[PDB]
Amino acid sequence: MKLGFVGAGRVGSTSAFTCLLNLDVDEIALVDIAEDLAVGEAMDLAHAAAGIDKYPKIVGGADYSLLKGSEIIVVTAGLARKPGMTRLDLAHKNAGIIKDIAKKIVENAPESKILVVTNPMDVMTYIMWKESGKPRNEVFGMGNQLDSQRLKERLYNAGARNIRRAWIIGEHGDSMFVAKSLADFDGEVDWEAVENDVRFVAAEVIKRKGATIFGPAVAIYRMVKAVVEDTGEIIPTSMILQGEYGIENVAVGVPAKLGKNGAEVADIKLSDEEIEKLRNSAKILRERLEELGY
Amino acid sequence: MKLGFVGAGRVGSTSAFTCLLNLDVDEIALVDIAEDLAVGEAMDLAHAAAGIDKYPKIVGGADYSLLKGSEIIVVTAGLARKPGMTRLDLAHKNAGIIKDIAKKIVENAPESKILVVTNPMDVMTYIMWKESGKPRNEVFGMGNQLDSQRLKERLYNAGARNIRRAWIIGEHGDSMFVAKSLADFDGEVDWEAVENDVRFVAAEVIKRKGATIFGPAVAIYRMVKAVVEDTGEIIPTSMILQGEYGIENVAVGVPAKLGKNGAEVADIKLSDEEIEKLRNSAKILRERLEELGY
Ligand SMILES: NC(=O)C1=CN([C@@H]2O[C@H](COP(=O)(O)OP(=O)(O)OC[C@H]3O[C@@H](n4cnc5c(N)ncnc54)[C@H](O)[C@@H]3O)[C@@H](O)[C@H]2O)C=CC1
Ligand SMILES: NC(=O)C1=CN([C@@H]2O[C@H](COP(=O)(O)OP(=O)(O)OC[C@H]3O[C@@H](n4cnc5c(N)ncnc54)[C@H](O)[C@@H]3O)[C@@H](O)[C@H]2O)C=CC1
Ligand code: NA
Ligand code: NA
């Protein structure tokens, strides 16, 4: 089991840490244009590793060669943004970097599953699958999981208990929605209040903490776990749809089955209103992609 | 089980994360002069928590009240430094903050074990024990563990295998040394090379990565684990000595026994040369304390 990480920033490195803490990993690789940053992350992860009596190979640098062998690669590389500076501006910039990465991931680690995390995730996930020759089952994105984690919290807060299932699907962003039809938990809650908090929690945290890290790392871990350990679990995942729910040619968050073969749309029936909400999100995402020449 | 954290900076927050990932914790508290920073860390840890189906109480702020109840408190609060700016300058500054914290920890969470991490750890550990009424068994410092983790790595690198024990003791800093007399592992290694790498690894990482985080978090976790779970383990810990090895009135790193009662000098015989190296470190630390009016 080798894990690959393109981007050794806050989320890349904490993701890798989390995985190291809970998975039987033999090798971890960290690629990043910031060469020294990637090496130092590697060094620090190794020191961490030695304290739980794990001793895997942890290499860090800037050559995509390091990725050779990876069963899966978490791509967090790019830029987050703010200081006024535009949404679409980063979309272009990152889209440039994502296209560029896919090419490198393919001429180095051809057979690796690719987990896209870089924002706007649904959009970058699509661009990744498009720019690499790969089948829609070897490229997907982390987002909804994290959204759902937030959901599961606001619920336990609002009284809910024995939360067996609770997901958020659709766009990882504004047009997201709770899949009420699948909620399973004891205790009455206010779906109004809850649906609301979640969407704006993302930035409520960013303005205070500076960025979102620990939430994202765990979500990423849960996905990687499901693949490296062939658990067969079902996790809201951003996936290229080719017909499902009347949607096509776009990535969007839908319940998926993760396992050694990557991801596959878990066929699960949704509310009639739930399909529209999904179709809306696809439209919005489809707009944003055409904006980019895809 | 409540964990308290004074300082929600890089190490405080990643420590708390690590603990959340591996301990059955009911409440986590994060105090920091940066109020919003502490809240955001709390929020993010909670989102993280929900993804491993843990749902503890995580509160964050600036009032030391949040600490009430803590079985143990990890203190990472202060400043790290560089841009030229002097060693001793921070020692004074942090010593001011540490004295100030001890008072608050005592009039809020009287019965809590206190884990000192803020650098120069051995020095702050002593100042903490002095400024709080507390017995030398309820205040100690994390350092040698982390040093040892690094050690265990450079060894596995140099061939060593089945490393059953391998510690670094003495000052957490320049006058540290390997306790060769207790090393236990298959394979010949070069004690020259190894002893050397370790001391300067700390900053080799800092210049690249920016700071040391994941190493420190795990070390801190291993200590907290041993206490909250009464494991009785023996871990190089920075401790106030009152006679042991011919040393007194100073904190320094010696093999210790951690358990529900905190820490106690594990009585372990050391090489004759090993005692001198320890006594030297005590002298250096004793100098640095008198420099501070202690
Ligand atoms: N999908 C999700 O749920 C979440 C996504 N994210 C996103 O992931 C991205 C990373 O966030 P952070 O970790 O905070 O970023 P950082 O913490 O800013 O990480 C970015 C790293 O990417 C590297 N990089 C930039 N260009 C590169 C290139 N051409 N090739 C290789 N490496 C390159 C940088 O050197 C940097 O270290 C952001 O877009 C952020 O919004 C963040 C949280 C959650
Ligand atoms: N003993 C060890 O092995 C290690 C010790 N450290 C040390 O721990 C300290 C923390 O490192 P970082 O996490 O990187 O620092 P940060 O990442 O700079 O964390 C410091 C936090 O302390 C807070 N703070 C400052 N003054 C305070 C006060 N009077 N009351 C409450 N909070 C206050 C700050 O707001 C800040 O968030 C440093 O001194 C560093 O050298 C770091 C690594 C290892
Ligand atoms: Na599968
Ligand atoms: Na004990």
Side-chain angles (χ1 to χ4, degrees), chain A residues 17-18 36 41 44 47 51 55 152 201 209 213-215 222, chain B residues 17-18 36 41 44 47 51 55 152 201 208-209 213-215 222:
Chain A
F17 173 65
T18 293
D36 277 301
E41 288 299 3
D44 200 20
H47 304 171
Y55 296 81
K152 294 171 71 110
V201 180
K209 171 176 168 54
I213 313 174
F214 302 121
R222 282 297 301 281
Chain B
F17 173 65
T18 293
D36 277 301
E41 288 299 3
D44 200 20
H47 304 171
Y55 296 81
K152 294 171 71 110
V201 180
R208 298 191 163 73
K209 171 176 168 54
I213 313 174
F214 302 121
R222 282 297 301 281

PDB file of all heavy atoms in Angstrom, chain A residues 17-18 36 41 44 47 51 55 152 201 209 213-215 222, chain B residues 17-18 36 41 44 47 51 55 152 201 208-209 213-215 222:
ATOM      1  N   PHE A  17      -1.021  12.630   7.319  1.00  0.00           N
ATOM      2  CA  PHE A  17      -0.837  12.348   8.747  1.00  0.00           C
ATOM      3  C   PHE A  17      -1.967  11.421   9.197  1.00  0.00           C
ATOM      4  O   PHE A  17      -1.729  10.320   9.724  1.00  0.00           O
ATOM      5  CB  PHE A  17      -0.818  13.682   9.521  1.00  0.00           C
ATOM      6  CG  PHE A  17      -0.810  13.563  11.032  1.00  0.00           C
ATOM      7  CD1 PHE A  17       0.261  12.989  11.700  1.00  0.00           C
ATOM      8  CD2 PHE A  17      -1.845  14.119  11.789  1.00  0.00           C
ATOM      9  CE1 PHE A  17       0.278  12.916  13.104  1.00  0.00           C
ATOM     10  CE2 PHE A  17      -1.842  14.047  13.180  1.00  0.00           C
ATOM     11  CZ  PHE A  17      -0.778  13.445  13.840  1.00  0.00           C
ATOM     12  N   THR A  18      -3.204  11.847   8.941  1.00  0.00           N
ATOM     13  CA  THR A  18      -4.360  11.100   9.425  1.00  0.00           C
ATOM     14  C   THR A  18      -4.289   9.656   8.950  1.00  0.00           C
ATOM     15  O   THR A  18      -4.484   8.715   9.725  1.00  0.00           O
ATOM     16  CB  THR A  18      -5.678  11.741   9.002  1.00  0.00           C
ATOM     17  OG1 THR A  18      -5.813  13.003   9.660  1.00  0.00           O
ATOM     18  CG2 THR A  18      -6.827  10.863   9.414  1.00  0.00           C
ATOM     19  N   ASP A  36      11.184  22.134  -0.827  1.00  0.00           N
ATOM     20  CA  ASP A  36      11.599  21.975   0.562  1.00  0.00           C
ATOM     21  C   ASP A  36      10.421  21.716   1.494  1.00  0.00           C
ATOM     22  O   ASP A  36      10.500  20.866   2.376  1.00  0.00           O
ATOM     23  CB  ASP A  36      12.455  23.148   1.043  1.00  0.00           C
ATOM     24  CG  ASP A  36      13.915  23.000   0.642  1.00  0.00           C
ATOM     25  OD1 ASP A  36      14.545  21.991   1.036  1.00  0.00           O
ATOM     26  OD2 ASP A  36      14.433  23.885  -0.069  1.00  0.00           O
ATOM     27  N   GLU A  41       7.699  18.170   5.338  1.00  0.00           N
ATOM     28  CA  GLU A  41       6.485  17.486   5.732  1.00  0.00           C
ATOM     29  C   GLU A  41       6.822  16.020   5.885  1.00  0.00           C
ATOM     30  O   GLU A  41       6.393  15.373   6.838  1.00  0.00           O
ATOM     31  CB  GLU A  41       5.371  17.669   4.699  1.00  0.00           C
ATOM     32  CG  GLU A  41       4.759  19.066   4.645  1.00  0.00           C
ATOM     33  CD  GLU A  41       4.097  19.486   5.951  1.00  0.00           C
ATOM     34  OE1 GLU A  41       4.174  18.702   6.926  1.00  0.00           O
ATOM     35  OE2 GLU A  41       3.509  20.601   6.005  1.00  0.00           O
ATOM     36  N   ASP A  44       8.797  15.361   9.096  1.00  0.00           N
ATOM     37  CA  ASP A  44       7.913  15.477  10.250  1.00  0.00           C
ATOM     38  C   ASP A  44       6.923  14.293  10.368  1.00  0.00           C
ATOM     39  O   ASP A  44       6.645  13.801  11.469  1.00  0.00           O
ATOM     40  CB  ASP A  44       7.173  16.813  10.189  1.00  0.00           C
ATOM     41  CG  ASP A  44       6.623  17.240  11.530  1.00  0.00           C
ATOM     42  OD1 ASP A  44       7.098  16.751  12.574  1.00  0.00           O
ATOM     43  OD2 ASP A  44       5.710  18.084  11.535  1.00  0.00           O
ATOM     44  N   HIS A  47       8.893  11.325  11.815  1.00  0.00           N
ATOM     45  CA  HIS A  47       9.036  11.428  13.261  1.00  0.00           C
ATOM     46  C   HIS A  47       7.709  11.071  13.915  1.00  0.00           C
ATOM     47  O   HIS A  47       7.677  10.333  14.889  1.00  0.00           O
ATOM     48  CB  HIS A  47       9.470  12.832  13.709  1.00  0.00           C
ATOM     49  CG  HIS A  47      10.735  13.284  13.050  1.00  0.00           C
ATOM     50  ND1 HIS A  47      11.204  14.610  13.190  1.00  0.00           N
ATOM     51  CD2 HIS A  47      11.618  12.677  12.274  1.00  0.00           C
ATOM     52  CE1 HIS A  47      12.304  14.731  12.515  1.00  0.00           C
ATOM     53  NE2 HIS A  47      12.611  13.577  11.932  1.00  0.00           N
ATOM     54  N   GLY A  51       6.547   7.261  16.565  1.00  0.00           N
ATOM     55  CA  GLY A  51       5.883   7.247  17.858  1.00  0.00           C
ATOM     56  C   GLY A  51       4.649   6.354  17.999  1.00  0.00           C
ATOM     57  O   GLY A  51       4.055   6.280  19.074  1.00  0.00           O
ATOM     58  N   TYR A  55       6.845   2.300  10.744  1.00  0.00           N
ATOM     59  CA  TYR A  55       8.104   2.692  10.104  1.00  0.00           C
ATOM     60  C   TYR A  55       8.044   2.578   8.574  1.00  0.00           C
ATOM     61  O   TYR A  55       8.888   1.913   7.970  1.00  0.00           O
ATOM     62  CB  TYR A  55       9.271   1.833  10.624  1.00  0.00           C
ATOM     63  CG  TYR A  55       9.600   1.974  12.107  1.00  0.00           C
ATOM     64  CD1 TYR A  55       8.864   1.295  13.073  1.00  0.00           C
ATOM     65  CD2 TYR A  55      10.672   2.765  12.538  1.00  0.00           C
ATOM     66  CE1 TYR A  55       9.170   1.409  14.428  1.00  0.00           C
ATOM     67  CE2 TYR A  55      10.983   2.889  13.889  1.00  0.00           C
ATOM     68  CZ  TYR A  55      10.234   2.205  14.835  1.00  0.00           C
ATOM     69  OH  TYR A  55      10.538   2.315  16.185  1.00  0.00           O
ATOM     70  N   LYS A 152     -23.812  15.769  10.358  1.00  0.00           N
ATOM     71  CA  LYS A 152     -23.974  14.850  11.471  1.00  0.00           C
ATOM     72  C   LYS A 152     -23.738  15.582  12.776  1.00  0.00           C
ATOM     73  O   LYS A 152     -24.391  15.297  13.765  1.00  0.00           O
ATOM     74  CB  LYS A 152     -23.082  13.616  11.318  1.00  0.00           C
ATOM     75  CG  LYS A 152     -23.488  12.750  10.125  1.00  0.00           C
ATOM     76  CD  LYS A 152     -22.503  11.634   9.801  1.00  0.00           C
ATOM     77  CE  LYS A 152     -22.536  10.525  10.848  1.00  0.00           C
ATOM     78  NZ  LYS A 152     -23.144   9.248  10.342  1.00  0.00           N
ATOM     79  N   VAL A 201     -21.180  27.096   7.427  1.00  0.00           N
ATOM     80  CA  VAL A 201     -20.218  26.707   8.459  1.00  0.00           C
ATOM     81  C   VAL A 201     -18.819  26.769   7.879  1.00  0.00           C
ATOM     82  O   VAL A 201     -17.896  27.269   8.512  1.00  0.00           O
ATOM     83  CB  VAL A 201     -20.451  25.285   9.000  1.00  0.00           C
ATOM     84  CG1 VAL A 201     -19.435  24.980  10.045  1.00  0.00           C
ATOM     85  CG2 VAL A 201     -21.821  25.165   9.612  1.00  0.00           C
ATOM     86  N   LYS A 209     -10.439  30.360  12.111  1.00  0.00           N
ATOM     87  CA  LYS A 209      -9.287  29.477  12.163  1.00  0.00           C
ATOM     88  C   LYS A 209      -8.270  29.815  11.071  1.00  0.00           C
ATOM     89  O   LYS A 209      -7.089  29.512  11.209  1.00  0.00           O
ATOM     90  CB  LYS A 209      -9.774  28.015  12.044  1.00  0.00           C
ATOM     91  CG  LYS A 209      -8.690  26.971  11.861  1.00  0.00           C
ATOM     92  CD  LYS A 209      -9.245  25.574  11.847  1.00  0.00           C
ATOM     93  CE  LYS A 209      -8.179  24.592  11.379  1.00  0.00           C
ATOM     94  NZ  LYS A 209      -6.895  24.653  12.149  1.00  0.00           N
ATOM     95  N   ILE A 213      -9.185  22.382   7.920  1.00  0.00           N
ATOM     96  CA  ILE A 213      -8.163  21.343   7.844  1.00  0.00           C
ATOM     97  C   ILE A 213      -8.594  19.985   8.402  1.00  0.00           C
ATOM     98  O   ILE A 213      -8.605  18.987   7.684  1.00  0.00           O
ATOM     99  CB  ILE A 213      -6.872  21.773   8.553  1.00  0.00           C
ATOM    100  CG1 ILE A 213      -6.487  23.200   8.143  1.00  0.00           C
ATOM    101  CG2 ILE A 213      -5.740  20.778   8.247  1.00  0.00           C
ATOM    102  CD1 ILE A 213      -5.301  23.767   8.914  1.00  0.00           C
ATOM    103  N   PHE A 214      -8.934  19.940   9.685  1.00  0.00           N
ATOM    104  CA  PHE A 214      -9.160  18.658  10.346  1.00  0.00           C
ATOM    105  C   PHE A 214     -10.403  17.962   9.816  1.00  0.00           C
ATOM    106  O   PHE A 214     -10.391  16.760   9.583  1.00  0.00           O
ATOM    107  CB  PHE A 214      -9.211  18.830  11.863  1.00  0.00           C
ATOM    108  CG  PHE A 214      -7.960  19.439  12.444  1.00  0.00           C
ATOM    109  CD1 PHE A 214      -8.015  20.627  13.157  1.00  0.00           C
ATOM    110  CD2 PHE A 214      -6.733  18.819  12.281  1.00  0.00           C
ATOM    111  CE1 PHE A 214      -6.886  21.194  13.689  1.00  0.00           C
ATOM    112  CE2 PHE A 214      -5.595  19.376  12.813  1.00  0.00           C
ATOM    113  CZ  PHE A 214      -5.671  20.571  13.522  1.00  0.00           C
ATOM    114  N   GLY A 215     -11.473  18.720   9.612  1.00  0.00           N
ATOM    115  CA  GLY A 215     -12.633  18.187   8.920  1.00  0.00           C
ATOM    116  C   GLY A 215     -12.255  17.515   7.603  1.00  0.00           C
ATOM    117  O   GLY A 215     -12.476  16.320   7.417  1.00  0.00           O
ATOM    118  N   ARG A 222     -11.528   8.845   5.377  1.00  0.00           N
ATOM    119  CA  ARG A 222     -12.635   7.898   5.276  1.00  0.00           C
ATOM    120  C   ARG A 222     -12.765   7.368   3.856  1.00  0.00           C
ATOM    121  O   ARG A 222     -12.999   6.183   3.641  1.00  0.00           O
ATOM    122  CB  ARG A 222     -13.952   8.515   5.747  1.00  0.00           C
ATOM    123  CG  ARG A 222     -14.115   8.587   7.262  1.00  0.00           C
ATOM    124  CD  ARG A 222     -14.148   7.208   7.940  1.00  0.00           C
ATOM    125  NE  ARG A 222     -15.230   6.370   7.433  1.00  0.00           N
ATOM    126  CZ  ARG A 222     -16.504   6.478   7.804  1.00  0.00           C
ATOM    127  NH1 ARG A 222     -16.862   7.388   8.698  1.00  0.00           N
ATOM    128  NH2 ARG A 222     -17.421   5.678   7.276  1.00  0.00           N
TER     129      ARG A 222
ATOM    130  N   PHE B  17      -6.298  17.211  18.065  1.00  0.00           N
ATOM    131  CA  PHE B  17      -6.794  16.393  16.953  1.00  0.00           C
ATOM    132  C   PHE B  17      -6.336  14.952  17.183  1.00  0.00           C
ATOM    133  O   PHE B  17      -7.152  14.016  17.240  1.00  0.00           O
ATOM    134  CB  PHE B  17      -6.267  16.981  15.628  1.00  0.00           C
ATOM    135  CG  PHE B  17      -6.544  16.153  14.389  1.00  0.00           C
ATOM    136  CD1 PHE B  17      -7.841  15.934  13.949  1.00  0.00           C
ATOM    137  CD2 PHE B  17      -5.487  15.675  13.609  1.00  0.00           C
ATOM    138  CE1 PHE B  17      -8.088  15.196  12.777  1.00  0.00           C
ATOM    139  CE2 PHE B  17      -5.720  14.938  12.450  1.00  0.00           C
ATOM    140  CZ  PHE B  17      -7.023  14.699  12.031  1.00  0.00           C
ATOM    141  N   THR B  18      -5.027  14.782  17.365  1.00  0.00           N
ATOM    142  CA  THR B  18      -4.464  13.440  17.481  1.00  0.00           C
ATOM    143  C   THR B  18      -5.163  12.670  18.590  1.00  0.00           C
ATOM    144  O   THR B  18      -5.564  11.515  18.417  1.00  0.00           O
ATOM    145  CB  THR B  18      -2.957  13.467  17.711  1.00  0.00           C
ATOM    146  OG1 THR B  18      -2.316  13.985  16.543  1.00  0.00           O
ATOM    147  CG2 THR B  18      -2.453  12.071  17.953  1.00  0.00           C
ATOM    148  N   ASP B  36     -11.031  34.031  18.659  1.00  0.00           N
ATOM    149  CA  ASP B  36     -11.661  33.433  17.488  1.00  0.00           C
ATOM    150  C   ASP B  36     -10.903  32.212  16.980  1.00  0.00           C
ATOM    151  O   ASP B  36     -11.510  31.203  16.631  1.00  0.00           O
ATOM    152  CB  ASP B  36     -11.893  34.458  16.376  1.00  0.00           C
ATOM    153  CG  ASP B  36     -13.167  35.262  16.589  1.00  0.00           C
ATOM    154  OD1 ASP B  36     -14.257  34.649  16.660  1.00  0.00           O
ATOM    155  OD2 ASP B  36     -13.081  36.504  16.690  1.00  0.00           O
ATOM    156  N   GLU B  41     -10.828  26.434  15.811  1.00  0.00           N
ATOM    157  CA  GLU B  41     -10.171  25.154  15.981  1.00  0.00           C
ATOM    158  C   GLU B  41     -11.199  24.188  16.525  1.00  0.00           C
ATOM    159  O   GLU B  41     -11.278  23.043  16.087  1.00  0.00           O
ATOM    160  CB  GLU B  41      -8.977  25.252  16.933  1.00  0.00           C
ATOM    161  CG  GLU B  41      -7.760  25.986  16.376  1.00  0.00           C
ATOM    162  CD  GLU B  41      -7.168  25.320  15.140  1.00  0.00           C
ATOM    163  OE1 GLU B  41      -7.754  24.312  14.679  1.00  0.00           O
ATOM    164  OE2 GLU B  41      -6.125  25.809  14.626  1.00  0.00           O
ATOM    165  N   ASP B  44     -13.671  23.093  13.818  1.00  0.00           N
ATOM    166  CA  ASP B  44     -13.015  22.176  12.894  1.00  0.00           C
ATOM    167  C   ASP B  44     -12.757  20.782  13.515  1.00  0.00           C
ATOM    168  O   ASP B  44     -12.911  19.749  12.852  1.00  0.00           O
ATOM    169  CB  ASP B  44     -11.716  22.807  12.390  1.00  0.00           C
ATOM    170  CG  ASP B  44     -11.222  22.184  11.106  1.00  0.00           C
ATOM    171  OD1 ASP B  44     -12.016  21.548  10.384  1.00  0.00           O
ATOM    172  OD2 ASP B  44     -10.024  22.343  10.813  1.00  0.00           O
ATOM    173  N   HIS B  47     -16.105  18.893  13.462  1.00  0.00           N
ATOM    174  CA  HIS B  47     -16.381  18.324  12.149  1.00  0.00           C
ATOM    175  C   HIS B  47     -15.503  17.096  11.950  1.00  0.00           C
ATOM    176  O   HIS B  47     -15.973  16.068  11.482  1.00  0.00           O
ATOM    177  CB  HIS B  47     -16.132  19.325  11.011  1.00  0.00           C
ATOM    178  CG  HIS B  47     -16.908  20.593  11.177  1.00  0.00           C
ATOM    179  ND1 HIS B  47     -16.685  21.708  10.336  1.00  0.00           N
ATOM    180  CD2 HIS B  47     -17.857  20.971  12.019  1.00  0.00           C
ATOM    181  CE1 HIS B  47     -17.479  22.665  10.703  1.00  0.00           C
ATOM    182  NE2 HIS B  47     -18.225  22.272  11.729  1.00  0.00           N
ATOM    183  N   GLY B  51     -16.734  12.479  11.718  1.00  0.00           N
ATOM    184  CA  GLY B  51     -16.349  11.506  10.708  1.00  0.00           C
ATOM    185  C   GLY B  51     -15.742  10.191  11.200  1.00  0.00           C
ATOM    186  O   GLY B  51     -15.417   9.317  10.397  1.00  0.00           O
ATOM    187  N   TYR B  55     -18.597  11.925  19.121  1.00  0.00           N
ATOM    188  CA  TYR B  55     -19.400  13.138  19.301  1.00  0.00           C
ATOM    189  C   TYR B  55     -19.191  13.781  20.679  1.00  0.00           C
ATOM    190  O   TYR B  55     -20.157  14.013  21.407  1.00  0.00           O
ATOM    191  CB  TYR B  55     -20.898  12.832  19.114  1.00  0.00           C
ATOM    192  CG  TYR B  55     -21.320  12.364  17.726  1.00  0.00           C
ATOM    193  CD1 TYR B  55     -21.153  11.038  17.334  1.00  0.00           C
ATOM    194  CD2 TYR B  55     -21.918  13.243  16.816  1.00  0.00           C
ATOM    195  CE1 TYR B  55     -21.551  10.601  16.072  1.00  0.00           C
ATOM    196  CE2 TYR B  55     -22.314  12.817  15.551  1.00  0.00           C
ATOM    197  CZ  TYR B  55     -22.136  11.492  15.181  1.00  0.00           C
ATOM    198  OH  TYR B  55     -22.533  11.054  13.925  1.00  0.00           O
ATOM    199  N   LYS B 152      14.442   6.844  17.101  1.00  0.00           N
ATOM    200  CA  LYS B 152      13.976   5.555  16.621  1.00  0.00           C
ATOM    201  C   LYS B 152      13.948   5.553  15.106  1.00  0.00           C
ATOM    202  O   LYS B 152      14.233   4.541  14.490  1.00  0.00           O
ATOM    203  CB  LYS B 152      12.627   5.177  17.237  1.00  0.00           C
ATOM    204  CG  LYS B 152      12.721   4.945  18.744  1.00  0.00           C
ATOM    205  CD  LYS B 152      11.373   4.782  19.435  1.00  0.00           C
ATOM    206  CE  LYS B 152      10.713   3.451  19.089  1.00  0.00           C
ATOM    207  NZ  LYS B 152      10.684   2.484  20.238  1.00  0.00           N
ATOM    208  N   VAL B 201      18.115  17.730  13.659  1.00  0.00           N
ATOM    209  CA  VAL B 201      16.951  17.411  12.830  1.00  0.00           C
ATOM    210  C   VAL B 201      15.857  18.424  13.101  1.00  0.00           C
ATOM    211  O   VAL B 201      15.218  18.923  12.182  1.00  0.00           O
ATOM    212  CB  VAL B 201      16.382  16.006  13.100  1.00  0.00           C
ATOM    213  CG1 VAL B 201      15.211  15.767  12.211  1.00  0.00           C
ATOM    214  CG2 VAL B 201      17.418  14.948  12.825  1.00  0.00           C
ATOM    215  N   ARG B 208      12.530  24.018   6.572  1.00  0.00           N
ATOM    216  CA  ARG B 208      11.833  23.541   5.374  1.00  0.00           C
ATOM    217  C   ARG B 208      10.328  23.677   5.509  1.00  0.00           C
ATOM    218  O   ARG B 208       9.670  24.357   4.730  1.00  0.00           O
ATOM    219  CB  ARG B 208      12.173  22.078   5.097  1.00  0.00           C
ATOM    220  CG  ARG B 208      13.636  21.823   4.820  1.00  0.00           C
ATOM    221  CD  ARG B 208      13.872  20.417   4.298  1.00  0.00           C
ATOM    222  NE  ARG B 208      15.181  20.292   3.666  1.00  0.00           N
ATOM    223  CZ  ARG B 208      16.326  20.268   4.337  1.00  0.00           C
ATOM    224  NH1 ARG B 208      16.316  20.364   5.657  1.00  0.00           N
ATOM    225  NH2 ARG B 208      17.477  20.156   3.691  1.00  0.00           N
ATOM    226  N   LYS B 209       9.800  23.012   6.523  1.00  0.00           N
ATOM    227  CA  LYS B 209       8.368  22.913   6.752  1.00  0.00           C
ATOM    228  C   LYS B 209       7.810  24.191   7.380  1.00  0.00           C
ATOM    229  O   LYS B 209       6.626  24.482   7.246  1.00  0.00           O
ATOM    230  CB  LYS B 209       8.091  21.682   7.644  1.00  0.00           C
ATOM    231  CG  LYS B 209       6.673  21.550   8.165  1.00  0.00           C
ATOM    232  CD  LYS B 209       6.471  20.280   8.944  1.00  0.00           C
ATOM    233  CE  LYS B 209       5.139  20.324   9.681  1.00  0.00           C
ATOM    234  NZ  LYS B 209       3.955  20.615   8.810  1.00  0.00           N
ATOM    235  N   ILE B 213       5.411  19.949  13.882  1.00  0.00           N
ATOM    236  CA  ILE B 213       4.034  19.738  14.316  1.00  0.00           C
ATOM    237  C   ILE B 213       3.665  18.274  14.568  1.00  0.00           C
ATOM    238  O   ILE B 213       3.287  17.904  15.678  1.00  0.00           O
ATOM    239  CB  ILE B 213       3.033  20.328  13.314  1.00  0.00           C
ATOM    240  CG1 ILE B 213       3.455  21.745  12.908  1.00  0.00           C
ATOM    241  CG2 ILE B 213       1.614  20.315  13.909  1.00  0.00           C
ATOM    242  CD1 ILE B 213       2.602  22.351  11.800  1.00  0.00           C
ATOM    243  N   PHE B 214       3.756  17.443  13.536  1.00  0.00           N
ATOM    244  CA  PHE B 214       3.232  16.083  13.633  1.00  0.00           C
ATOM    245  C   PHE B 214       4.038  15.237  14.605  1.00  0.00           C
ATOM    246  O   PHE B 214       3.473  14.493  15.396  1.00  0.00           O
ATOM    247  CB  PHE B 214       3.147  15.434  12.253  1.00  0.00           C
ATOM    248  CG  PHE B 214       2.285  16.197  11.278  1.00  0.00           C
ATOM    249  CD1 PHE B 214       2.813  16.673  10.087  1.00  0.00           C
ATOM    250  CD2 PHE B 214       0.949  16.429  11.552  1.00  0.00           C
ATOM    251  CE1 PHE B 214       2.043  17.370   9.193  1.00  0.00           C
ATOM    252  CE2 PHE B 214       0.166  17.123  10.661  1.00  0.00           C
ATOM    253  CZ  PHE B 214       0.715  17.597   9.474  1.00  0.00           C
ATOM    254  N   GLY B 215       5.358  15.361  14.556  1.00  0.00           N
ATOM    255  CA  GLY B 215       6.194  14.752  15.576  1.00  0.00           C
ATOM    256  C   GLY B 215       5.724  15.103  16.985  1.00  0.00           C
ATOM    257  O   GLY B 215       5.357  14.227  17.765  1.00  0.00           O
ATOM    258  N   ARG B 222       1.177  10.315  23.072  1.00  0.00           N
ATOM    259  CA  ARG B 222       1.683   9.143  23.781  1.00  0.00           C
ATOM    260  C   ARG B 222       1.735   9.399  25.280  1.00  0.00           C
ATOM    261  O   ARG B 222       1.388   8.538  26.082  1.00  0.00           O
ATOM    262  CB  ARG B 222       3.052   8.712  23.257  1.00  0.00           C
ATOM    263  CG  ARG B 222       3.015   7.936  21.944  1.00  0.00           C
ATOM    264  CD  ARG B 222       2.275   6.593  22.047  1.00  0.00           C
ATOM    265  NE  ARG B 222       2.870   5.712  23.047  1.00  0.00           N
ATOM    266  CZ  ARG B 222       3.968   4.984  22.853  1.00  0.00           C
ATOM    267  NH1 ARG B 222       4.595   5.024  21.687  1.00  0.00           N
ATOM    268  NH2 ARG B 222       4.442   4.222  23.830  1.00  0.00           N
TER     269      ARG B 222
END
